[PDB]
């Protein structure tokens, strides 16, 4: 019961931490990089003009 709840909490915490480190960090980084690339490209178009 309480031990099973604690074990489930620990497993969920470990999975969430692994995901935040690997996917959430990298997925967010990739999306931000794409958006920032587009924005800096608009800035480069301004520089072109």
């Amino acid at each position: 019961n309480p031990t099973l709840f604690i074990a489930q909490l620990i497993n969920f915490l470990l999975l969430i931490f692994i995901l935040r480190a690997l996917l959430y960090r990298p997925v967010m980084n990739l999306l931000n990089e794409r958006t920032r690339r587009i924005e800096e490209s608009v800035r480069d178009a301004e520089k072109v003009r």
């Binding site: 099973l4 489930q8 969920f12 969430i16 995901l19 935040r20 997925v27 999306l31």
Partner: protein, 245 residues
């Protein structure tokens, strides 16, 4: 259309246990939770893929979902939009995974040994959403995170939000603190009732005339599960922002 047979009987329970208890006490919910976590990790690995800014490829779907969640969190608030974003994303697609797999073939009959005997045929599915322990742990973790964020941002603010809200005469505190405390228990009970209710419906209603009765029921249940996952994810951020505000 007619449903001449198939209505054998109906049977439900609070939860289901699993094997492996000798080395470590394991319930069927732990088995379901492990499966959901493994599926999430596999989706992230496939979503990551080469990760060389590849458009579409089934990774763009996960990217769009994450971007939508990030936009929602940013709209809710911005003080902890970055640090707490992984925390909310943990619930996102995990509560969703728990809601999913309930409509799988024999989701309620998975791991039954067998209506002849049923001696030790504990159904080893026990949907992780349909377990009080998982919801209680998730709600406790969310409440702890909100309290820690409030203490770190405004330690005096968290205490002054109740103790010093109105020092003279009465104050918003106590009632506010009691409401916040019920909020963790309320969130836990919400996940407990949800998913469990869907499974009870998929059992009982489909027990009589299992032909186009379970279909709209399962559609509504899936929509409700997705809505509940989104609601919990947004409510964690809302409580955190209210604590900050």
């Amino acid at each position: 259309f007619f449903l001449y047979t198939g209505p054998p009987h109906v049977e439900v329970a609070a939860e289901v246990i699993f094997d492996g208890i000798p080395g470590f006490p394991i319930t069927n919910s732990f088995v379901v939770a492990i499966i959901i976590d493994i599926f999430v990790i596999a989706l992230a690995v496939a979503a990551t893929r080469n990760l060389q800014m590849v458009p579409r490829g089934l990774q763009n779907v996960m990217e769009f979902i994450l971007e939508s969640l990030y936009n929602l969190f940013r709209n809710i608030n911005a003080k902890y939009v970055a640090t707490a974003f992984p925390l909310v994303a943990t619930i996102f697609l995990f509560v969703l995974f728990g809601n999913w797999f309930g409509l799988l073939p024999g989701v309620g009959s998975i791991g039954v040994c067998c209506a002849a005997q049923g001696k030790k045929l504990v159904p080893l599915f026990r949907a992780p959403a349909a377990d009080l322990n998982f919801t209680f742990a998730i709600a406790v973790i969310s409440f702890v995170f909100i309290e820690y964020w409030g203490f770190r941002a405004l330690g005096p603010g968290y205490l002054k939000k109740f103790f010093n809200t109105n020092g003279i005469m009465s104050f918003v505190g106590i009632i506010e603190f009691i409401s916040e405390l019920v909020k963790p228990f309320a969130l836990a009970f919400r996940l407990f009732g949800n998913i469990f209710a869907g499974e009870v419906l998929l059992v009982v209603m489909a027990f009589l005339v299992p032909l186009l009765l379970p279909l709209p029921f399962y559609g509504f249940e899936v929509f409700v599960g997705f809505i509940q996952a989104l609601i919990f994810a947004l409510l964690t951020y809302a409580f955190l922002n209210i604590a900050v505000t």
